[model samples]
Target: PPAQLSVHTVSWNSGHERAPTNLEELLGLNSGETPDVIAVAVQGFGFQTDKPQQGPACVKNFQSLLTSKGYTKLKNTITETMGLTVYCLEKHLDQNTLKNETIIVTVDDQKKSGGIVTSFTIYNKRFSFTTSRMSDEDVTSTNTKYAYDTRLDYSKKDDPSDFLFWIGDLNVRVETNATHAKSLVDQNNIDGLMAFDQLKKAKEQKLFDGWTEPQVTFKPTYKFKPNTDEYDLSATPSWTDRALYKSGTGKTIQPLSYNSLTNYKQTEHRPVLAKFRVTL
Candidate 1:
């Protein structure tokens, strides 16, 4: 948590579904419950914040909150990283096409402890459109409907500019034992088309999932509240809430610890965090 952080919102888990039309409302009038570092993740949709004050408190002050030049520095950092990734994470894809059609994931699967590798992968389906998320969430908000919109045009097409990788709790789930994402798809019909086998086919062809090594920690995001402290080792909670995809070199998925929220110095599911970075 920073000195002045944005209030946290649990995508849709907090029971509140919509995003605050205005920042004031999202911040709430509560004295204590505010977070110093609100994590924002774009899931592809959005709602309007209230008008009592400005709009989207966290989003508006996001970069500046980190530091006056946080946003600019972040962009510079990203540029430098992309340079390194060009030779590493973007190993398979050609540089010329990457800038035009590739989507680079500079961060992903980060543990709440902020101590893990940022997941990485490349998608050649769209331009350099950056979609974010509403990570750091708050409990009581005016927007009661959880609407995650990150402005991504996704589809299941097998074309040159058709590479994609949608991961994280993703506000949804899929199957782990059904051979493909079939079990999950069978149970819940509306989730995006997820096929583990599809990635497998891609692997046989060449593309791969960005380094999920040490273990395939990818599991159901809905952890059935564990009362004890054995969650890290014990697979108590069960709910398919993560996914992976990409071009070239697949990695094993490692289940990063998410047994409790105390790790982030709070309570609740703690946003089951994981960190993954692009590597060759």
Candidate 2:
């Protein structure tokens, strides 16, 4: 068996927009490299749970594209406005030891915001992917229980996953005025802009503790003007969509690439893609 596995993850807030006709650039397949697993998390997809036939066309498009490339849809979990779909290479997945489990936690009364956690085992190594879109109150409230917060319970049950990936349109803002953020973006000073990021403040408050995000060299992925490169100043340009990783079982999980797919301009928020290599 191979000692390592490659995983590619993408998260986007579609703003109730239609899916793009082709996803090669969004999936990073145009570069001619294929990952062993692909996890797609989307917020604002407008999927109706009651009407399976009226679901977003993107679901069928994703299946058609990935299935042709020898990947199997392992699990798909959905809420009123969010969805998480995972695809695994057929060769790398052993049916007997798969042992997959999925959980959906809705933090809002309207079921508009929440999280999805999907876990499975391959080659005796466990991997978990969590996608969440939380509000400001949920981020700071001590009483609010996040989906990833349940990982401790899984560990207590002796079911800890080796690799954990948390990704989605997290709704974390830049905590600054639009003009200041615009100036920083114009200066190409990503570090200066990120200094006031809400995600960092959340981490300081002991939220998403122990998770590591790859260095973000790209510009902010949100508050765009759709179909253009311009940022809408109503909200400060921020990295709302993100990917964070942690290795629970002491195995190596290395980030290969982390970037925002700027080519996808149909929505106000660009999609974020992260690639990783995990050692078994």
Candidate 3:
């Protein structure tokens, strides 16, 4: 017998802009539906290590929003300009079984290159929520895992999470000229555009090997002008922010929906939202 849980995750690069005021609409909570957990990740100059600050206003708004809904903060970790926040229902948490750890990997003088793993047990099943930002270099997913594992000293002997989630700015760019990419987007040829997505190339190179991102049916989430429908035109449109998942000891992980929150147009990057139904 397996227990099922619904999870919702969102990732955004705010370009150092302030958090939008409409969180419910931005987070899909306006529909009066709630997931078992909510995970959020943000990146920008605001998240840089020199400040080590979460989007102060945005983070507070999220905190207030979740707390008002009776959710508890499982873990919140920030390193440089990358942030990971996990919120869980109070009824499902085993307070005594909660542990949190962070891994920081610096590469090419980049302060943010690692991840955060929050471990907890619910109904005797372990779960971990992870978020990371990898360097825009030749980095393997295995080594990325190694960084987190080395920090936690994780081994098979340690309890494995029934489910795992990795979300954040993956730095996967679109390999195409701005004009061609925009033309494809105008035609709504999502698959055609996705064909040039670097994540696929990364997967082929084993950087994101074994990780799964739901098929893209929406437009690319990056290089937009703040508060507008226009692309910045300075960079190729790409799905920079991403949500990835895995089942640790569980049977299956099902992604229900994956779409970009187009209305939250406050940065050059649109936020990405993903929903999942996990069988643990």
Candidate 4:
């Protein structure tokens, strides 16, 4: 018999904005099914001095909401501008075997663009989550060069993680003029818009070789006007924030749902969420 675990993940580029007070809809609890694990990755989380007495306000909100629902914080790691937080159901955690590790890879001296890899094991199965942010100029080169470099080091050939999730403001954009992209968006032609997405180009360039993303029915998630539904048009609307998954140990990792949380309009980019069911 195989065990099943439902996992929820979110990736947001907050643009140094404040955390929202309530996150029930953001976590997808409104659908009445609670996932076994929840992973959140944020970029441009702003300064430590902006944090309140407790911690990063987003972490505090997540803690307050999920702790009451029988989940434990597995790991919370943050760099100057990026953050990754993971939580799992208390009953499913084996503290003794839960080997947790975090690796930060920065592209520059100031650490503005980079990736964070956070991994842990439970029930003898390893799960790795990576969240990264790269500039437009760096996306093509960095995606191939350093984004998942540490992941390769962490997951050796002999013992690789069963599941790997990469999520965050990846900065890949639709390579088209604003008018054309917006026209396609207005027509709800997601496939048309995605055809020019830079991620596809990166894939052709041999990066994220084995990773898979769920069918994206939602529109582009970036370059929105803050606090509104309007596209800024300064940059073509693109699926900059994204989520991708891979299985290293031949276990099944199925995406149940993938969407953008439109209610979160505080930043120029909306939060993206994905739900997955892993078989072990």
Candidate 5:
């Protein structure tokens, strides 16, 4: 086995938008360098809640594309509005030596406070990917419960995952006025706008204690006008769809790129993609 691996994680709150006509750039099939692992996390009420049922169809398209490229899905888990899927090169996966598990927790009466954790091991090194959609009003309690529940359950396993990636349409938002936020975006003052992002507070309170996100240089990925680059003032534009990573002792992870795919404008939220090189 190689001592190092490359991983690409993408998060998009589709907002019930249908799958794109192509997965070439989204999956990096044209990037010339194939990632050893690819994880896709999606949110919004697109998992069959609306008419025409785009969720299953979108997922099937992804499956077909990945499998055709010689990659096999390691694990896939879906909730009402959130989903997570992990894929690895077929040859790297040992059919006889793999284990995976999933857990969904409800936090509110609306049945919207849910998360999915999908984990597996190959050649004895464990890996986990998680995604969640919770109420933004009071995520402190709900997030705390979700974090503890997931962390506790995975901690008791025979071996903790060497590498863990958490990606999703989180309830985080920007605590700023729309006009000011738009001004920052216009001036490319990314750091200034990020200063008011709620995820920073959530991290400070230990919701994602040890997790780390690559320095973001992309614009906000939410509250956009469908099929356009324009931002809607109805809500503060924020980096709602996100990705974070953590590595256990003796494991290393370094991000190569972190960006939002602005080309996919079918929904009010654009997609975020992160690429990392890991060693163990």
Candidate 6:
């Protein structure tokens, strides 16, 4: 008795230049209609900012939708450019048969602004949510449960049936072993995204990479991965691409494509894309 659900995450450098900072632009989505799912940006300081990480909202239309609320709730769940909630069923649904479903997004974890207070999200069997926030060893620890189980956190009023999700950017140390990641969290050690290890906490949740077999990467997206300019992944080749999922409602996803959207050919952090489909 599982509900159908699937997701696609795109390493959208938000249209290459940067994600649309305006709601009008977000809705405009030159790509015909808005993307059913978008991996929102949560930029940080000392990186892409001329001054501070705070520049413009990553999900422009998402920001607009929240603003319409005008006043913040007693403990407003949604923010300006941060986590925005909406029902997937509200959109071009009906084409697929699904149980009552809700999809919530968490973005803007970068020092820029609008964060969803990390991990407050809940989950269930039939319905679920996922996040794309800035990764910090500290933040991940605090919300380890949610990251491990998207179906068990931050959801409300919705019926539980089957759930699925994808998340992580996690600026943590991702080593082939969990030792590095566990030590950091246990020893209050920060940095190092022991990606697979952290993901292991998800129990049975599946972690998939779009470019599974690996390809001849020419540039390094960041200098960190290998941390050697000689292997400049910060330039044209990268392995930082990732994806995740919880409970298989016969919902399987695959990489769409993370073709470079940026104009500069500096780092190898090429955009990663994952696509999925649900079958009863």
The C-alpha lDDT values of all candidates are 0.27, 0.82, 0.72, 0.81, 0.78, 0.34
State the lDDT of candidate 4 residue by residue for 96-167, as single tens digits: 898888877877676767778888888888899888766655543334532444443334446778998998
Query: What are the per-residue Cα lDDT tens digits for candidate 1 across 1-280?
Result: 1111121222212221233333322222133432321222323212222233323453355433334422221121112111101112112334454443333332224311010112222333231112222233422121211112322223222322222233333322232443333334345532333442223443343322231212333333333343332223232233322333332223222222222122221112333332222222
Native-referenced Cα lDDT, model 3: 0.72
Q: How well is each residue in 1-280 modelled by candidate 3, as lDDT tens digits?
A: 3378888988887756666788887666888988888888777664544343434675688889988888998777776666777788877776665554444444435565666666666766666666665554535435432222233222232665677777777777889999999999999999999899877776665554466788889988878777799988898988887887766564588999888888887678888889898876
Looking at candidate 1, the ten consecutive residues that score lowest on lDDT are: 77-86
- After superposing all C-alphas onto the true structure, candidate 6 shows an RMSD in angstroms of 11.1
How accurate locally is residue 168 in candidate 5, as Cα lDDT from 0 to 100? Answer: 78
Better of 2 and 3 by TM-score: 2
User: Which of 4 and 6 is ahead in TM-score?
Assistant: 4
Task: State the lDDT of candidate 5 residue by residue for 1-280, as single tens digits.
Answer: 8888889999888866677877877766667878889999887673635567665676689888788878888777666777778899887887667776676766566666667788878767888888877654545353442322344234335666788888877677889999999999999999999999877787677667677889999999989888899999899889988888887655889999989988898989998889999886
**Candidate 4 lDDT (Cα, 0 to 1):** 0.81
Better of 4 and 5 by lDDT: 4
Whole-model lDDT for model 1 versus the true structure? 0.27
Model 6 lDDT per residue over 90-193, tens place: 33333234333333444325433213322211132243434444443424434442232232243222532343444334332233433443344445333233
153, model 1: CA deviation in Å? 8.6
Candidate that scores best on lDDT = 2
Least accurate 10 contiguous residues by lDDT in model 4 = 145-154
Scored against the true structure, residue 82 in model 1 reaches a CA lDDT of: 17
TM-score to true structure, per model: 0.33, 0.91, 0.85, 0.91, 0.90, 0.42
What C-alpha lDDT does candidate 5 achieve relative to the native structure? 0.78
Which candidate order results from sorting by lDDT in descending order? 2, 4, 5, 3, 6, 1
Please give the lDDT score for candidate 6: 0.34
On the 0 to 100 scale, the lDDT of residue 26 in model 3 is 64
Name the lDDT value of residue 124 in candidate 2.
Answer: 87
